[PDB]
């Protein structure tokens, strides 16, 4: 079994450098060549260079070409690749494969799991919740919707359960959205009317990375 | 350069159906077209590659042809655990491109998106700050755009939105979005408004209230 | 000597619009134009080498085009950090020459100024001087006109201007006006206003005082 | 890693001459071009002259030639930029750009962070802060607007502060402008009509140049 296993650095300051480590396992290091793509948060798949430990050397994707530098040490059997430069448009997904030939021309066979890169200048804030309720008094007659907001935190990820994981169906976590350096997103969730308020509604949002665990129940009013 | 470009961002089809996704390539790319797909993990394995035609390790049930500068991958069983984004890509030039990906979707009736506003919350108006939130949960398709009013018009700045994927049972849509303001300017109006527009009425479904009715 | 021209001298636009600033030479360029960036403090960086086409190690929401004479630089999703003045050059011939340059300024309501008068404080006038300010502050559009008198007159001597760069919490400008008499013709007149007209209302939001009342 | 370091601020007679350095640092010196870019405060960006550390350098702009002079020191990375006979209009920041090379172009890639020249014969005075007390709530109802006039001082910068700084927004501290041969700004501050004078509120105006510190409680009246 062939295995691209990799990692690096992965939170840096704008103007920063990185450098991604690619480990091969299964094969001998120096009968292949490794590609790096990129994959900004919007998908699309960017394809920067191709390194050849062997017949030593490489050959870059205009564009990434000059921020970045492909290496690799034949010894450790480990492909490195390096961002200079850093920027804001380059927190994303790095990807590395195996090329083979085979009739034709090359393709990319094995892919790493690929590092995540997040290029911020922002600094682990812990998030503040606060509950999401009918508001107008006004209901939806029938069934319910109740929320949850998670402002101003970083970095990610969140977790977000309702009643500590009893309630289940009906349950929608958003995507983060990255508000002013910060991150923020929401969870609604929906339950008969006859629950809520009768019957109480719970979020238990936690930010691992500010030692945050908190439980926002859902009352009435405002 | 070479452009690989694949009609077909979304492509919507049912558990069962045999899909076909299509990629073209702005020139004759001579039978070097390699297929990649990407589960939701965000890993992406090799399907098939050499103008298709060619397994790697992956089930038979995947299979590829073409030539010249039309290619499509397909599937003969679509597996739930087929809902990927799949990118065809080019080795017969520097520098090496990628289509731009066609993710799938399941088959779903027209459903119509539930909205909810929700005024700020005391907790959050003490510290002085005030989010307006607007939920639209459970639609179909996906496309969908949300417009904001205070007392009756505009607001476009400080309006956050996020989307789903696609949802594990039911193959609906649900989006936030978020309108945040200072707790001064918020206080200065009384009407907020959250109005969806989706391809399921041609009347704008709106949901509102009055800073004064809580 | 290769003039170069800037089509403006400043453009207004909003974060999350696309900007176009265009550069036009006196003579064919050969397409060796680049482009630099001056942040409000200065500091200025290489943006964009070889006809607005090649960079540095920018943001890829930068770019710019063009050929002969006329070239153009393109920021697309315009974000807070990129409110700043470019300029574009040619190496082609010597001596190498700039563009006039463009600034780039945030879109935001109109709004008049606040404006306050100040008489000259006692310290100040057993130092043999008068000094008389006036503060026009936050007001849009940055365009403004000041305005002496001195029971009822002229006052084109004298006065001393100053303009703050556009805000960055809000998108709005200041200006602070000052009249420098000498005490002696300072006691020699009552009333000392301020007048300031702003494409924001017919009739200036005049202030002033009068020596006898204080 | 590549850069060029300017060299502090010129205060200097008209009549007089003076020489700036550049320093670079982070790649070879004599591989490069050094060019010099004038800036006066009428934004306008200027080129005055190039030249060639490895060689007998020069190649000036038929203006600032014969007026200016640049020279080298291999033996040291740095450049330099003599100015002569000075006058108001030769007042500007002056920056030192590297020349590189790319198929028929060249362009400036790295700038240093400029240095100010001031062409004045004035000497260094402590300035004079003046009380700018509001003497008609006619103006502007409803909040107050203080100010601080700071005049006939040399020579910039001069920082200005309200209550330490525990007083921050609603305050505009204007350019300075150049008025008898002196500097001259003023500063505006607004708070509430409640907080003056009943809480105080005084401007603090710092003087490096002089050893000044000048703290300004505004008081009513005139």
């Given at each position: 079994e062939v295995q691209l296993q990799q990692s690096g650095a992965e939170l840096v300051r704008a103007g920063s450098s990185v450098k991604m480590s690619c480990k091969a396992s299964?094969?001998?290091?120096?009968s292949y060549g490794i590609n790096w793509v990129k994959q900004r948060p919007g998908q699309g798949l960017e394809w920067i260079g191709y390194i050849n430990p062997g017949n030593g050397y490489t050959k870059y994707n205009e564009k990434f070409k000059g921020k970045t530098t492909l290496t690799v040490d034949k010894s450790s059997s480990t492909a490195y690749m390096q961002l200079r430069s850093?920027?804001?448009?380059?927190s994303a997904v790095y990807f590395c494969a195996r090329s083979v030939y085979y009739g034709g021309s090359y393709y990319f066979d094995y892919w790493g799991q690929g590092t995540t890169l997040t290029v911020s200048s922002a600094k682990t804030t812990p998030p503040s919740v606060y509950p999401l309720a009918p508001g107008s008094?006004?209901?939806?007659?029938?069934m319910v919707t109740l929320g949850c907001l998670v402002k101003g935190y970083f970095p990610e990820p969140v977790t977000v359960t309702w009643n500590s994981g009893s309630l289940s169906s009906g349950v929608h976590t958003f995507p983060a959205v990255l508000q002013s350096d910060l991150y923020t997103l929401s969870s609604s969730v929906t339950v008969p009317s006859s629950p809520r308020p009768s019957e109480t509604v719970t979020c238990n949002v936690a930010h691992p990375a500010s030692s945050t665990k908190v439980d926002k129940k859902i009352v009435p009013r405002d | 350069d070479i452009q690989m470009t694949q009609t077909t961002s979304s492509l919507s089809a049912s558990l069962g159906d045999r899909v076909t996704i299509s990629c073209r390539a702005?020139?004759?790319?001579?039978?070097?077209l390699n297929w990649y797909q990407q589960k939701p993990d965000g890993t992406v394995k090799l399907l098939?590659?050499?103008?298709?035609r060619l397994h790697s390790?992956?089930?038979?049930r995947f299979s590829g042809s073409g030539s010249g500068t039309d290619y499509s991958l397909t599937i003969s069983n679509l597996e739930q655990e087929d809902i990927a984004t799949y990118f065809c890509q080019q080795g017969?030039?520097?520098?090496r491109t990628f289509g731009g990906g066609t993710k799938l979707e399941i088959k779903r009736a027209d459903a119509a998106p539930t909205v909810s506003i929700f005024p700020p919350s005391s907790e959050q108006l003490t510290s002085g700050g005030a989010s307006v939130v607007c939920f639209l949960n459970n639609?179909?398709?996906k496309d969908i755009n949300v417009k904001w009013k205070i007392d009756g018009s505009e607001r476009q700045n400080g309006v956050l939105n996020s989307w789903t994927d696609?949802?594990?049972?039911?193959?609906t849509y649900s989006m936030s979005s978020t309108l945040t303001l200072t707790k001064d300017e918020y206080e200065r109006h009384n009407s907020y408004t959250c109005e969806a527009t989706h391809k399921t009425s041609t009347s704008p479904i709106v949901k509102s209230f009055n800073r004064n009715e809580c």
């Amino acid at each position: 079994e062939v295995q691209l296993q990799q990692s690096g650095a992965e939170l840096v300051r704008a103007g920063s450098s990185v450098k991604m480590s690619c480990k091969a396992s299964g094969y001998t290091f120096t009968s292949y060549g490794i590609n790096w793509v990129k994959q900004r948060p919007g998908q699309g798949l960017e394809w920067i260079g191709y390194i050849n430990p062997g017949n030593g050397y490489t050959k870059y994707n205009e564009k990434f070409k000059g921020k970045t530098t492909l290496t690799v040490d034949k010894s450790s059997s480990t492909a490195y690749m390096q961002l200079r430069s850093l920027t804001s448009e380059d927190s994303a997904v790095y990807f590395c494969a195996r090329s083979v030939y085979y009739g034709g021309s090359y393709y990319f066979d094995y892919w790493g799991q690929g590092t995540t890169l997040t290029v911020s200048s922002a600094k682990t804030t812990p998030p503040s919740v606060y509950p999401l309720a009918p508001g107008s008094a006004a209901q939806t007659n029938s069934m319910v919707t109740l929320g949850c907001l998670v402002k101003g935190y970083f970095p990610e990820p969140v977790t977000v359960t309702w009643n500590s994981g009893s309630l289940s169906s009906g349950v929608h976590t958003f995507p983060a959205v990255l508000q002013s350096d910060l991150y923020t997103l929401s969870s609604s969730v929906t339950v008969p009317s006859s629950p809520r308020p009768s019957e109480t509604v719970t979020c238990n949002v936690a930010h691992p990375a500010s030692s945050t665990k908190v439980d926002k129940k859902i009352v009435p009013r405002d | 350069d070479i452009q690989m470009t694949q009609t077909t961002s979304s492509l919507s089809a049912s558990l069962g159906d045999r899909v076909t996704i299509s990629c073209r390539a702005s020139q004759d790319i001579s039978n070097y077209l390699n297929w990649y797909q990407q589960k939701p993990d965000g890993t992406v394995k090799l399907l098939i590659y050499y103008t298709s035609r060619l397994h790697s390790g992956v089930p038979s049930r995947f299979s590829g042809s073409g030539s010249g500068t039309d290619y499509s991958l397909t599937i003969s069983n679509l597996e739930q655990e087929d809902i990927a984004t799949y990118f065809c890509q080019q080795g017969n030039t520097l520098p090496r491109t990628f289509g731009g990906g066609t993710k799938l979707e399941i088959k779903r009736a027209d459903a119509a998106p539930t909205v909810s506003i929700f005024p700020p919350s005391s907790e959050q108006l003490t510290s002085g700050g005030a989010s307006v939130v607007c939920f639209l949960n459970n639609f179909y398709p996906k496309d969908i755009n949300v417009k904001w009013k205070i007392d009756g018009s505009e607001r476009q700045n400080g309006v956050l939105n996020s989307w789903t994927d696609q949802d594990s049972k039911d193959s609906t849509y649900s989006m936030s979005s978020t309108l945040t303001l200072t707790k001064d300017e918020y206080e200065r109006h009384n009407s907020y408004t959250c109005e969806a527009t989706h391809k399921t009425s041609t009347s704008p479904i709106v949901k509102s209230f009055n800073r004064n009715e809580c």
